Amino acid sequence: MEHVAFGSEDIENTLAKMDDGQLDGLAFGAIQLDGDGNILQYNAAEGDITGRDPKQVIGKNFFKDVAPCTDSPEFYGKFKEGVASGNLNTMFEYTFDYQMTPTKVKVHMKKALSSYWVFVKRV
Numbered sequence: 001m002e003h004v005a006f007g008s009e010d011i012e013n014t015l016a017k018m019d020d021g022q023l024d025g026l027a028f029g030a031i032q033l034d035g036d037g038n039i040l041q042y043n044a045a046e047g048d049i050t051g052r053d054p055k056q057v058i059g060k061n062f063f064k065d066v067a068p069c070t071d072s073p074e075f076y077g078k079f080k081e082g083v084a085s086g087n088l089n090t091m092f093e094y095t096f097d098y099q100m101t102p103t104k105v106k107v108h109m110k111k112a113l114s115s116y117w118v119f120v121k122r123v
């Protein structure tokens with residue numbers, strides 16, 4: 001395990017430039033998106049929560065392709081507001097239900113220091 005808690009105040013500093021291997025050591029799901037929502041990084045914990053293969057989703061668009069259930073004002077709308085402002089720091093619960101058993105999660109989206117993080121744990 002990497003020793004980082006979900007929701008930590010300086011999480012973007014701790015995960016800064018973490019490589020794909022170390023990201024796979026986190027206790028929580030971690031996705032890194034570009035400002036368009038394309039997937040740059042996606043860790044093992046997230047693949048375990050959602051069923052997706054962390055190796056295959058890299059390069060797909062999260063909102064258009066992988067996660068249409070997040071293409072909504074409550075998810076994508078918050079993301080894009082944060083991208084446009086260059087300020088993003090929002091934590092909310094959400095249900096993932098596309099081609100999967102509906103799974104409720106706590107989501108933390110936060111601008112990265114490089115890029116935007118989506119951190120995920122079950123609730």
Ligand SMILES: *C(=O)/C=C/c1ccc(O)cc1
Nearest residue numbers: 050067068069070096098
């Ligand atoms: C809704 O379509 C959500 C899908 C989803 C969320 C998070 C993932 O990492 C993968 C798919």
